Amino acid sequence: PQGLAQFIKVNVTLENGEPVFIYTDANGQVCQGAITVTQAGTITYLLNDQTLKGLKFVGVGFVTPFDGIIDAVTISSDGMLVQLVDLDKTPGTTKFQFVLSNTANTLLVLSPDPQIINRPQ
Amino acid sequence: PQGLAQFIKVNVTLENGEPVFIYTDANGQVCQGAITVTQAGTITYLLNDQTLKGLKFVGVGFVTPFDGIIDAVTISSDGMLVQLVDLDKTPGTTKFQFVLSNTANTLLVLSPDPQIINRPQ
Ligand SMILES: [Ca+2]
Ligand SMILES: [Ca+2]
Ligand code: NA
């Protein structure tokens, strides 16, 4: 008994001194639009930090954190991965932004554009 | 040789089972729109968590964390206070969102409406 294990790479570069986020699938295709979850499963995000600003994941930020779609976020000790876990059958749509620390200053970094997850009914 | 110390309270209630953020000043008056930082100083945010979801600050998130407006962010060990510090003469405009943990689940909570800080030329 099992679900889907999806993978996205979180590519961050510095453009005019500010981070820019480009999301690619495992063979390098730019990700287009919503991620769909049809079953209990995981989405693994791998940080590829090209900024020199020592970026690390500290979590995934949600405006509707009790909406029941993603049920848990998991993070590797070194901040290089964060995973989203859907542990049940709750349908709907949710959005989120990545939250990262940096070693240049003490402000947290946020991805500007919300990622969308659609859990169909 | 000194600056200004501003105080806002972040009042979080649970509306329809998701958090809603109202900001109030020293006098308990609801405020909206931009904060001005017009010389090196501090903005202190107090948490008033009426959600029952054990919110605490873990930091402040910025899409453009290297723009020079806010130079540091401090946080109290109990997550009830965060402060934004301007330590230089950089004029410009920055935006941020509060980043909170909760005790219900492992998703981070974001305030949905970016607060603006304008530091005049
Ligand atoms: Ca779920
Ligand atoms: Ca500054
Ligand atoms: Na808990």
From TrEMBL, chains A, B:
Gene3D superfamilies named among the record's database cross-references: Cupredoxins - blue copper proteins
Residue sites binding Ca(2+) 2 per the record: 68-69, 71, 86, 88
Binding site for Zn(2+): 68, 71, 88, 90
Any Pfam family the entry gives: DP-EP
Binding site residues for Ca(2+) 1: 14-15
SUPFAM superfamilies on file: Cupredoxins (SSF49503)
Binding site for Mg(2+): 68, 71, 88, 90
GO molecular function annotation: metal ion binding
Domain of life: Bacteria
Keyword tRNA-binding among record annotations: no
Keywords: Calcium, Metal-binding, Zinc
InterPro entries: Cupredoxin, DP-EP
Protein name per the record: Autocatalytic aspartic peptidase
Species: Shewanella oneidensis (strain ATCC 700550 / JCM 31522 / CIP 106686 / LMG 19005 / NCIMB 14063 / MR-1)
